[PDB]
Amino acid sequence: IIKCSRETEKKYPQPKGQKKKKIVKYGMGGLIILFLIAIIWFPLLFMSLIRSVVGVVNQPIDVTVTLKLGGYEPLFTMSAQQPSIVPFTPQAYEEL
Amino acid sequence: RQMKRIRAKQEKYRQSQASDHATVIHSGDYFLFESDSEEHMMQRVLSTMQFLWVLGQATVDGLTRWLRAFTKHHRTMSDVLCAERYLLTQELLRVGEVRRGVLDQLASELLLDRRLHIPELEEAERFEAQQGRTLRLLRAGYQCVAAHSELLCYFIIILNHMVTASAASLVLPVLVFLWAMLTIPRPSKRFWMTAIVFTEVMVVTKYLFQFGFFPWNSYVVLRRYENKPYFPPRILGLEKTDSYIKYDLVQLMALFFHRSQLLCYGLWFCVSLAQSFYQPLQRFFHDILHTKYRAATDVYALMFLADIVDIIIIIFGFWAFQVPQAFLFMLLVQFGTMVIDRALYLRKTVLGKLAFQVVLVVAIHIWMFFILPAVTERMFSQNAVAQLWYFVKCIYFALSAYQIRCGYPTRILGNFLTKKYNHLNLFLFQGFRLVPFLVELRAVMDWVWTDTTLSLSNWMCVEDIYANIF
Amino acid sequence: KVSPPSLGFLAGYGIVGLYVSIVLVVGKFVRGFFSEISHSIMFEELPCVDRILKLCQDIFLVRETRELELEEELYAKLIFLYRSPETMIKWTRERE
Amino acid sequence: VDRILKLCQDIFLVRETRELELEEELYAKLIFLYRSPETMIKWTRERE
Ligand SMILES: CCCCCCCCCCCCCCCCC[C@@H](O)O[C@H](CO[C@H](O)CCCCCCCCCCCCCCC)COP(=O)(O)OCC[N+](C)(C)C
Ligand SMILES: CCCCCCCCCCCCCCCCC[C@@H](O)O[C@H](CO[C@H](O)CCCCCCCCCCCCCCC)COP(=O)(O)OCC[N+](C)(C)C
Ligand SMILES: CCCCCCCCCCCCCCCCC[C@@H](O)O[C@H](CO[C@H](O)CCCCCCCCCCCCCCC)COP(=O)(O)OCC[N+](C)(C)C
Ligand SMILES: CCCCCCCCCCCCCCCCC[C@@H](O)O[C@H](CO[C@H](O)CCCCCCCCCCCCCCC)COP(=O)(O)OCC[N+](C)(C)C
Ligand SMILES: CCCCCCCCCCCCCCCCC[C@@H](O)O[C@H](CO[C@H](O)CCCCCCCCCCCCCCC)COP(=O)(O)OCC[N+](C)(C)C
Ligand SMILES: CCCCCCCCCCCCCCCCC[C@@H](O)O[C@H](CO[C@H](O)CCCCCCCCCCCCCCC)COP(=O)(O)OCC[N+](C)(C)C
Ligand SMILES: CCCCCCCC/C=C\CCCCCCCC(=O)O[C@H](COC(=O)CCCCCCC/C=C/CCCCCCCC)COP(=O)(O)OCCN
């Protein structure tokens, strides 16, 4: 590896005492800085991304009511499912 | 002097060796390092209680004297003015005849001076100096607050805006960060007048809207629009609440107090024409700010420390669990702004810092007070995290403005912890090194924005050697 | 409202500890490139590596042709070269 | 470690004032110091 570096240095001499090229410095440094900041930040993104549960409304599709005395027999039993379950309209919510 | 010595030594090495870039780098021999001419319990309990008592007294008296050290300038100034006041008021009271003689009764301008005394003034002086258990501390604290009235006013405005986040409550801190904190050491009288007028108009307008006859306020519209951040009155700040005024009387009182203190001490076709009347004023303001003679100082460490505390605040808010989708965005932008700020400090460009500061204040304010409530809840109903974050950011803005006004000094390079080889410095340096990813970024960015011949690896070697040697 | 039961373990010591552990482990691993780089400066700042490269090639070639005794002697020479830094300075000096 | 600390400070200062050639020469000297242990013993010897 060192020999390859030395041959490369021989092939393209650099002037005696000079500013390092801005383009190479910017590319290498931006790459490293972006990599380090990504390491710092992305785990937070994933942790906050998996726990993105969204509330889904569940509305009872059936309601059953039973009136029972002692242990003899349900005196009354009624179940309402589709047309007798009226969801609240905004106007009704306002009234409430 | 250091540069001349180094050049001379290198010339001596050249002459001694007298007897391609990689070759200069890989050019070292032993002769460099040759020495060139050396080149029974009750008494103990009483002792402990007296010890604690005297320690407390020493601590409080040290605090008082330190605060008095803060007040030194204004205290001496008030002393000389009050002495002159007593001397003048006699001749003013009897008739009032001569101005030169009464001033010359006791080198026209001297900061500190001594002349004949008057029994009444020192009489009162050591009468007040007689009492010092608490009253001296209170007097010192009040004196400090009076001496730093401008900071108090700025602080009150920021606190007021922190609560009641609304455009009406927003326009003034923007002026603070963009106009008041940049003019000249003394912000222009026009700014104080506009602050006082604006707060008066705001209190009256809120009072007028407060009345329930207006349609917005019906007890039904208000109830349904209880926590919706974008209700029009709430955004404009005209919404009615029992506490309609929330740090507005205090702000006005503070502004007037500052004005009074300053007064007692100191000085107090059509489109083309309109834009040529307006814009040159702004250009003149910016030019006079950019080019002027000022004392230089470096406060980069405090700015960075403020940003670090800000990141800690964001992470704590993230842990305190919507808003996280905004916390992450602010976190990433915070990292970016810290990098740009580091680059500006290294390059030492005042203009770049000024532009970045203006952009930053405008963007933070807009994002925090509009977009954030649009994507989340009210900023001030909750999110004490958001309010604390904004307060720290405001401190950062103040430091940056001060830095711009003073200007960058020369000789910025060098870690601030390696100025003294003290035990505390060693602990701080090791602690700073311990934190993850700071030496990494610190070395890489310094290499990027400091001009040099060395490659990244070579720079890494120099930095490591220096740290170990320290 | 209801959401799918993907709550699992939540933050506030739940999964935060894993994030801290991963960031510290990666921080140590990255510091490995920055911490003690100087120590290996006597083995990587060589101006000319021609003799050492030739010596290693000689070891390979002798090992190929089955004359083990030479391989042992060459290996001894190489080990001694890496055993004394000053002879390494002498040996890797830029040729004139 | 006085001499080495002074040398590192010299590198920083020269790098600050923009005279790169001196920076290259000083860096070469520092690298050679860390490249030879015996010169390091000689260089870090307790001053008299
Ligand atoms: C992931 C989050 C980050 C994403 C990347 C965005 C953030 C990157 C910010 C990088 C710093 C930007 C600095 C902007 C310039 C500040 C200093 C200024 O001086 O730069 C000048 C101009 O710089 C050049 O334009 C070079 C490019 C500048 C912008 C860099 C873009 C390349 C990306 C670098 C950032 C990479 C960040 C990666 C983060 C992961 C240099 O000229 P100078 O000699 O002072 O002239 C003096 C002028 N005076 C007289 C008025 C004072
Ligand atoms: C979020 C997205 C980020 C972008 C995508 C990921 C990008 C890749 C991750 C970052 C890659 C960093 C590459 C660093 C390459 C270093 C090359 C080395 O030679 O540079 C030296 C400095 O390198 C230092 O060792 C850097 C120290 C830190 C290295 C560790 C951080 C990067 C780890 C990258 C791991 C990537 C894993 C990817 C998995 C898919 C200085 O150059 P020098 O040797 O003098 O030149 C000799 C003569 N030449 C020019 C003729 C050759
Ligand atoms: C909700 C939205 C409200 C918008 C309101 C906009 C208002 C923005 C500007 C605020 C008012 C302008 C102030 C600018 C002042 C500049 C000139 C100023 O320096 O002159 C001062 C002088 O100022 C005047 O004294 C008072 C000016 C009062 C101006 C009232 C403007 C009212 C505007 C109302 C707008 C309402 C809009 C409502 C929209 C719904 C100098 O004072 P000084 O000489 O040192 O005082 C000495 C006092 N003595 C004599 C007792 C010793
Ligand atoms: C750390 C331990 C805890 C304490 C921390 C500090 C706590 C501070 C608490 C708040 C202190 C409020 C101080 C109020 C100062 C009033 C200043 C006001 O009087 O100034 C005058 C009024 O200014 C304007 O009105 C601006 C509005 C200020 C309104 C303040 C109202 C305070 C009322 C106090 C009433 C006390 C009544 C006591 C019984 C009679 C004009 O100035 P003037 O007196 O000419 O001379 C000024 C120079 N002096 C002071 C050195 C002589
Ligand atoms: C319902 C809600 C109502 C809200 C109403 C808000 C009203 C706000 C009005 C704001 C007016 C600002 C006026 C600024 C006046 C400056 C006066 C001028 O003189 O300033 C000069 C220069 O002005 C400064 O440059 C002011 C710069 C302010 C820049 C603010 C930018 C804000 C951008 C906001 C963008 C918002 C976008 C929102 C989404 C589209 C410096 O002068 P100065 O040194 O004193 O010397 C005065 C005495 N002399 C002349 C005799 C010496
Ligand atoms: C939950 C975590 C929250 C912790 C919050 C900590 C945040 C730390 C941020 C770093 C603070 C930096 C403090 C900077 C001090 C100013 C130093 C100075 O250089 O700046 C001044 C100007 O710069 C800006 O004006 C300063 C920015 C405003 C700083 C306000 C910070 C408030 C601190 C609150 C302390 C609370 C203590 C509570 C203890 C229990 C220059 O002097 P100036 O004042 O021009 O006039 C000279 C008068 N002198 C000479 C007599 C002094
Ligand atoms: C949830 C915990 C996260 C970690 C918290 C750690 C808290 C530690 C609290 C105090 C640390 C303060 C000390 C560090 C401050 C240095 C101040 C300073 O001087 O600033 C620069 C700042 O250093 C840099 O320039 C590099 C850093 C800037 C880029 C920031 C990269 C992004 C921020 C990363 C934060 C870390 C991410 C994980 C958390 C670990 C640390 C927060 C370094 O010094 P110089 O400028 O040489 O001194 C000049 C003196 N005139």
Structure tokens at B281: 């004023």
Residues 6+ apart with CB under 8 A from B224: A94
Residues 6+ apart with CB under 8 A from C6: A50, A51, A53
Task: Tell if the CB–CB gap between C38 and B464 is shorter than 8 Å.
Answer: yes
**Tokens 């083990």, residue located:** C68
Structure tokens at B344: 């500006």
Residue B150: count other Cβ atoms within 10 Å of its Cβ: 17
Structure tokens at A89: 């309209």
The distance from CA C62 to its chain's CA centroid, rounded to whole angstroms, is 27
Experimental approach was cryo-EM
Widest CA span in chain D: 35
Would you say A68 and A74 are in contact if contact means Cβ atoms under 8 Å apart?
A: yes
CA distance A63 to B235: 44
How would you class B435 by CB atoms within 10 Å of its CB: exposed for 0-12, middle for 13-18, buried for 19 or more? exposed
Would you say B297 and B409 are in contact if contact means Cβ atoms under 8 Å apart?
A: yes
Residues of B90-121 as b/e, b for ≥16 C-beta within 10 angstroms? Answer: eeeeeeeeeeeebeeeeeeeeeeeeeeeeeee
Query: Kindly report the CA angle at A11 between A8 and A13, in degrees rounded to 5?
Result: 100
* A29 backbone dihedrals φ, ψ, rounded to 5°: -75, -40
Pairing mode of beta strands A63-69, A73-80: antiparallel
Shortest CA distance from C25: residue in chain A: A39
* C84 backbone dihedrals φ, ψ, rounded to 5°: -130, 110
Residues of B134-147 as b/e, b for ≥16 C-beta within 10 angstroms? Answer: eebeebbeebbeeb
CA distance C14 to B71: 51
**Tokens 């109830």, residue located:** B223
End-to-end CA distance of chain C: 84
Would you say B462 and B454 are in contact if contact means Cβ atoms under 8 Å apart?
A: yes
Q: If DSSP codes are grouped into helix, strand and coil, which group holds residue B457?
A: helix
How would you class B50 by CB atoms within 10 Å of its CB: exposed for 0-12, middle for 13-18, buried for 19 or more? exposed
Q: Where are the alpha helices (DSSP H) in C8-66?
A: 16-31, 50-65
Long-range CB pairs of B388-392, under 8 A, 24+ apart, other chains included: B388/B313, B389/B310, B389/B313, B389/B314, B389/B317, B389/B330, B390/B162, B391/B158, B391/B162, B392/B306, B392/B309, B392/B310, B392/B313
Residues of chain A contacting D20 with CB distance shorter than 8 Å: 17-19
Residue B48: count other Cβ atoms within 10 Å of its Cβ: 10
Q: Could you tell me the CA-to-CA distances from D47 to B34, B346, D3, D34, D42 in Å, in that order?
A: 14, 37, 10, 20, 10
CA distance B241 to B234: 10
CA distance B315 to B321: 10
Would you say B453 and A20 are in contact if contact means Cβ atoms under 8 Å apart?
A: yes
Amino acid letter, residue B189: K
Q: Could you tell me the CA-to-CA distances from B319 to B244, B307, B313, C84 in Å, in that order?
A: 33, 19, 10, 56
Question: From the list D17, D27, D39, which residue is nearest B30 (CB)?
Answer: D39
**B402 Cβ below 6 A of ligand 3:** no
Structure tokens at B386: 């958001």
Would you say B425 and B418 are in contact if contact means Cβ atoms under 8 Å apart?
A: yes
Amino acid letter, residue B372: L
Identify the chains in contact with A, defined as 3+ C-beta pairs within 8 A. Answer: B, C, D
* A73 backbone dihedrals φ, ψ, rounded to 5°: -170, 140
Q: If DSSP codes are grouped into helix, strand and coil, which group holds residue B157?
A: helix
Instruction: List C residues 38-57 in contact with D (Cβ-Cβ < 8 A).
Output: 38, 41-42, 45
Task: Tell if the CB–CB gap between C1 and A57 is shorter than 8 Å.
Answer: yes
Amino acid letter, residue B204: V
Q: If DSSP codes are grouped into helix, strand and coil, which group holds residue B220?
A: coil
Q: Could you tell me the CA-to-CA distances from A90 to A96, B224, B225, B232, B330 in Å, in that order?
A: 10, 12, 14, 22, 36
**Tokens 């920055």, residue located:** C34
Beta bridge partners of A78: A65
Shortest CA distance from C36: residue in chain B: B464
Category of B84 on φ-ψ map: left (φ > 0), alpha (ψ -120 to 50) or beta: alpha
Q: If DSSP codes are grouped into helix, strand and coil, which group holds residue B466?
A: helix
**B205 Cβ below 6 A of ligand 5:** no
C93 Cα to chain D: minimum distance (Å): 12
C89 Cβ under 8 Å from any chain D Cβ: yes
CA distance B449 to A22: 9
Would you say A80 and A63 are in contact if contact means Cβ atoms under 8 Å apart?
A: yes
Would you say B464 and C34 are in contact if contact means Cβ atoms under 8 Å apart?
A: yes
Widest CA span in chain A: 107
Of B294, B406, B283, the residue nearest B353 (C-alpha): B406
Would you say C19 and A47 are in contact if contact means Cβ atoms under 8 Å apart?
A: yes
Q: DSSP letter for B29, please.
A: -
Given resolution (angstroms): 3.5
Structure tokens at B446: 């310094």
Residues 6+ apart with CB under 8 A from C12: B319, B321
Residue B133: count other Cβ atoms within 10 Å of its Cβ: 8
Beta bridge partners of A77: A66
Q: DSSP letter for C92, please.
A: T
B468 Cβ under 8 Å from any chain D Cβ: no
Instruction: List D residues 12-41 in contact with A (Cβ-Cβ < 8 A).
Output: 20-21, 24
Amino acid letter, residue B283: R
Of B212, B74, B224, the residue nearest B149 (C-alpha): B74
CA distance B109 to B79: 15
Shortest CA distance from A24: residue in chain B: B448
The distance from CA B414 to its chain's CA centroid, rounded to whole angstroms, is 23
Residues of B166-177 as b/e, b for ≥16 C-beta within 10 angstroms? Answer: bebbbebbebbb
Q: Where are the alpha helices (DSSP H) in B265-383?
A: 270-290, 300-319, 324-347, 350-366, 372-375
CA distance A39 to C24: 11
DSSP B115-151: ----HHHHHHHHHHHH--SSHHHHHHHHHHHHHTHHH
Q: At what angle do helices B135-147 and B149-162 cross, to 10 degrees?
A: 80
Residues of chain C contacting B468 with CB distance shorter than 8 Å: 38
Interface with chain D: mutation pick from C40, C41, C88, C90, highest number of D CBs within 10 Å: C41
* A67 backbone dihedrals φ, ψ, rounded to 5°: -105, 120
Amino acid letter, residue B65: R
CA of A81 to the centre of ligand 1 (A): 66
Write out chain A in H/E/C secondary structure: CHHHHHHHHHHCCCCCCCCCCHHHHHHHHHHHHHHHHHHHHHHHHHHHHHCCCCCECCCCCCEEEEEEECCCEEEEEEEECCCCCCCCCHHHHHHC
Would you say B242 and B217 are in contact if contact means Cβ atoms under 8 Å apart?
A: no
Would you say B418 and B429 are in contact if contact means Cβ atoms under 8 Å apart?
A: yes
Q: Could you tell me the CA-to-CA distances from A83 to A57, A79, B296, B304, B454 in Å, in that order?
A: 18, 11, 79, 64, 80
Protein residue with its CA nearest to atom 52 in ligand 5: B188
Identify the chains in contact with C, defined as 3+ C-beta pairs within 8 A. Answer: A, B, D
B163 Cα to chain C: minimum distance (Å): 29
Structure tokens at B18: 């007298």
Q: DSSP letter for B94, please.
A: H
Question: From the list B23, B26, B440, which residue is nearest C34 (CB)?
Answer: B440
Task: Tell if the CB–CB gap between C47 and B319 is shorter than 8 Å.
Answer: no
Q: Could you tell me the CA-to-CA distances from B220 to A95, B25, B33, B215, B223 in Å, in that order?
A: 11, 81, 88, 10, 5
CA of B304 to the centre of ligand 7 (A): 7
**B406 Cβ below 6 A of ligand 7:** no
Residues in chain D: 48
Residues 6+ apart with CB under 8 A from B261: B146, B149
Residues 6+ apart with CB under 8 A from B331: A41, A44, B311, B314, B315, B318
D12 Cβ under 8 Å from any chain C Cβ: no
Task: Please tell me the number of the ligand nearest to residue A32's CA.
Answer: 2
Q: If DSSP codes are grouped into helix, strand and coil, which group holds residue B166?
A: coil
A36 Cβ under 8 Å from any chain B Cβ: yes
CA distance B252 to A41: 44
B318 Cβ under 8 Å from any chain A Cβ: yes
Alpha-carbon dihedral sign for residues B252, B253, B256, B257: negative
Residue B405: count other Cβ atoms within 10 Å of its Cβ: 18
CA distance B128 to B435: 51
**B190 Cβ below 6 A of ligand 3:** yes
